[PDB]
Write a protein that binds this DNA or RNA. Structure first.
Lengths: 252, 120, 56, 231
RNA sequence: UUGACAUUGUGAAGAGUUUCUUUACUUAUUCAAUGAAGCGGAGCUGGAAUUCAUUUUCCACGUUCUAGCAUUCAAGGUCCCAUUCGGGGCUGAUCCGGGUU
RNA sequence: GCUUGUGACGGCCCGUGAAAAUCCACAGGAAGGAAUAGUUUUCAUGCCAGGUCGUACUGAUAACCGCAGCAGGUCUCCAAG
RNA sequence: GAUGGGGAAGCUCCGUUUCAAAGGCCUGCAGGCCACCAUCGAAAGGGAAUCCGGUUAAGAUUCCGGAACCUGG
């Protein structure tokens, strides 16, 4: 048969990300002696809408300690921060909104955003609009704090890993319908060529497994095992269950 | 027994960078001045339209090698005819040969220079 | 346009202050005030720390 | 005094822009440098068999200088010297005295690796010096046990470059002499006694012991802490 | 995808002469960042302990109201040089291992 | 009034709608600097040069492509009563 | 899309802050600072500077007359 759609996306050509209007990637600092022992203050000069991404950004400046200059950095907004604000960062840093701290430097029940999965990864988790991540306990043994994640999950990571207080701005984006193809169109041209989308059962057998007709139907189960092959994997994958469900705990 | 390096970034330390000491003079000889003046200026152009510019505008029209340029042109004229050159404009004719309209200073009569050259 | 600022003399490109063709007067005023007051409050923090540390 | 004013700098965090310093520790060195250093360290790791742990017992500087002083007496010739001897012994003996008996018998170290090796095989050797720092090392691993089995006196030493200089060469890796004049035989025996005591006699024991095992500054101090602070 | 073998080293502990289980290590290998900046170790120092103060068990390490500013091997202090004008060294900025982390 | 440019405003977004060369300014205070004089050329004035290539005409129911002087197709500006 | 490099029997492929000893800036050398740094990529993007009148069978913001402007030195 042919090659299917999703088999092709690995090559990019059409399906890459439309990153012209992007600002620089939003990240933390490079970890260093200051954050490692003490703190440092930076100042947000302005905050801004990056395109193809909710959850607006903040351009923040710091004194280059090692040289007479300024180092600008691109943080993710935190729902209350504002221009002219001072942004303290490091191990000995104060516990307020927008400041960034390790996790051993704060208690459980606290929350945080944009958190590092590892020291000096510069932000992996809780990078999305109105999201957040929770601390639930510490363990000074191996310096391991444990957390809960917006997928409902839980994890354990180094307590020294940095994270910024609060939740990410943007919030109720999903609660607004798009109402029509066109807003979605713009929403997606600013990201990638992953939209519109044709249904496999409308396609032809050569163009998709589902494909052929006389009737828009599939023919066999759409739960394609995890030990399957690229080109077979279209539909439900590791289906531990299927259909509608209730309910419902994410993990407990 | 130590040394002070005040930056983590190391670079190739400089050295003498010798000059060349050729043994056998790569070119057996130097070329002559390929593109001399005679070679530069090829031919006058005595089309009636050109003779008009001569008679009226104090210009000489010349066919020239493509390899030239205005500086060289001017230089060659002033040598070969002992003249003051006011300015020049140039072009490429569609037959693949270069033309130059060379305006003269007020002191010189392009016409008299032409019949001095023996074309008129 | 930018490359004309090179041709023109300096009275066209600056006013007669610190931060002339760079900042507005109200911002420079602001920044002056900020400097002076913070360096005073800095002195105050210093002497407060001294009388406090020498308290015990 | 009342125009100069003493204004220190904090050089502290979040202020007082940091000064320049000796960053030789944190260098991002070149590849070859890192390679040689890391090879050294790796060799220090990875417990060394006795067959190589023979090495890195080189000498005391005093005995070193004494031995080198002895060996300098038994230098080889140079260009001009060989030139002179070959002019003269020829000029005389070719139409005169006996062939090559017209010039004296020589004395020198009899350097050169395979030459030395054959001399030892023939028991014609009297003392041996083995540079410790060869690369590759299989060249030389088999000499100490060889001289031991052959009952010959050897020592491991420092500076194959010094050995070279002893021959007016860049390096030799070896130097082992036989010819000695009667005058220096006392010092010969003097050095031999101490040297067989230090190297040769201790062979069979050193042949038992391994090397390596070292950790390095950080993990070493860490183990010291995990032992002392915890026991 | 799973198993065996090789890469693949060093220690310990031990159920049925075994040869199998976890768990110890850094050098192998692997991951990441950085113009490879401040690791580690003992410290000092400082508070706050005591005593007619001295370690005599205690403890920790200089920046946080504010949309400022922080650059010229750093000023100071201490030595040399003769110092005419200007240089140079130590501290200021503890010392020691050069395992970038 | 038509075209056109332009300004300040207002509306739109889960859309907020290039980059670099280049030019300038600011802070900075390295340095150099006047008296028989010495400093300045971002004021004016004065002097030399400014290279190479292209530059005609069509742009279509006859100059392009459609085998062709093909009713087809082919980007765009000006726009009277 | 070269280089360092790394794959591939190889034609060549990968990658373009590359696990690299990657230089040039001023005042023979002494001082000094400062560096992810090939190169190409738009005749409609960006961009230093010009206009009038007149002239030819056919050229013109290009020529002539007049009047400017910008760069560089």
């Amino acid at each position: 048969g042919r090659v299917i759609r999703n088999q092709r996306k690995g090559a990019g050509s059409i399906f890459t990300s439309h990153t012209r209007l992007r600002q620089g990637a939003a990240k933390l600092r490079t970890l260093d002696y200051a954050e490692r022992h003490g703190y440092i203050r930076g100042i947000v000069k302005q905050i801004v809408h990056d395109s193809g991404r909710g959850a607006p950004l903040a351009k923040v400046v710091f004194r280059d300690p090692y040289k007479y200059r300024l180092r600008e950095e691109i943080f993710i907004a935190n729902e209350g921060v504002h221009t002219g604000q001072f942004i303290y960062a490091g191990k000995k840093a104060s516990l307020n909104v927008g400041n960034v701290l390790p996790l051993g430097s704060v208690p459980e029940g606290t929350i945080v955003s944009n958190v590092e999965e590892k020291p000096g990864d510069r932000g992996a988790l809780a990078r999305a609009s109105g999201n957040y991540v929770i601390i639930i306990g510490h363990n000074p043994d191996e310096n391991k704090t444990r957390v809960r994640l917006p997928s409902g999950a839980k994890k354990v990571i180094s307590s020294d890993a940095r994270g910024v207080i609060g939740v990410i701005a943007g919030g109720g984006r999903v609660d607004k319908p798009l109402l029509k193809a066109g807003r979605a169109f713009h929403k997606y041209r600013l990201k990638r060529n992953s939209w519109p989308k044709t249904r496999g059962v409308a396609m032809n057998p050569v163009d998709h497994p589902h494909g052929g007709g006389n009737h828009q139907h599939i023919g066999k189960a759409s739960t394609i095992s995890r030990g399957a092959v690229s080109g077979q994997k279209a539909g439900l994958i590791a289906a531990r269950r299927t259909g509608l469900l209730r309910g419902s705990q994410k993990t407990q | 027994a130590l040394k002070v390096r005040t930056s983590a970034t190391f670079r190739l330390p400089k050295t003498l960078k010798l000059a060349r000491a050729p043994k056998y003079a790569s070119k057996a000889v130097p070329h002559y001045n390929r593109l001399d003046s005679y070679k530069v200026i090829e031919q006058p152009i005595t089309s009636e339209t050109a003779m008009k510019k001569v008679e009226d505008g104090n210009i000489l029209v010349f066919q020239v090698s493509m390899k030239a340029n205005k500086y060289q042109i001017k230089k060659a004229v002033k040598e070969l005819y002992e003249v003051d050159v006011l300015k020049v404009n140039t072009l490429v004719r569609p037959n693949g040969t270069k033309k130059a309209y060379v305006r003269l200073t007020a002191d010189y009569d392009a016409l008299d220079i032409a019949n001095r050259i023996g074309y008129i | 346009r930018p490359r004309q600022y090179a041709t023109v003399s300096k009275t066209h490109k600056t006013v007669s202050r610190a931060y002339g063709g760079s900042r507005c007067a109200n911002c420079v005023k602001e920044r002056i005030i900020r400097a002076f007051l913070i360096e005073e409050q800095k002195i105050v923090k210093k002497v407060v720390k001294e009388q406090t540390e020498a308290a015990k | 005094n009342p125009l100069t004013h003493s204004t220190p700098k904090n050089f502290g965090i979040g202020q007082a822009v940091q000064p320049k310093r000796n960053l030789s520790r944190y260098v991002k060195w070149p590849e070859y440098v890192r390679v040689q250093r890391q090879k050294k360290i790796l060799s220090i790791r990875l417990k060394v068999p006795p067959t190589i742990a023979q090495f890195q017992y080189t000498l005391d500087r005093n005995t070193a200088a004494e031995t080198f002083k002895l060996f300098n007496k038994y230098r080889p010739e140079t260009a001009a010297e060989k030139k002179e001897r070959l002019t003269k012994e020829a000029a005389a003996v070719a139409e005169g005295k006996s062939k090559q008996d017209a010039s004296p018998k020589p004395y020198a170290v009899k350097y050169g690796l395979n030459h030395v090796v054959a001399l030892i095989e023939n028991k014609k050797a009297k003392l041996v010096l083995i540079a410790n720092d060869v690369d590759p090392i299989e060249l030389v691993v088999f000499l100490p046990a060889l001289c031991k089995k052959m009952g010959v006196p050897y020592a491991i030493v420092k500076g194959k470059a010094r050995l070279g200089t002893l021959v007016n060469q860049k390096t030799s890796a070896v130097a082992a002499l036989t010819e000695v004049r009667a005058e220096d035989e006392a010092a010969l025996a003097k050095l031999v006694s101490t040297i067989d005591a230090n190297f040769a006699d201790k062979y069979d024991e050193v042949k038992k012991h391994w090397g390596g095992g070292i950790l390095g500054n950080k993990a070493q101090a860490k183990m010291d802490k995990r032992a002392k602070n915890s026991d």
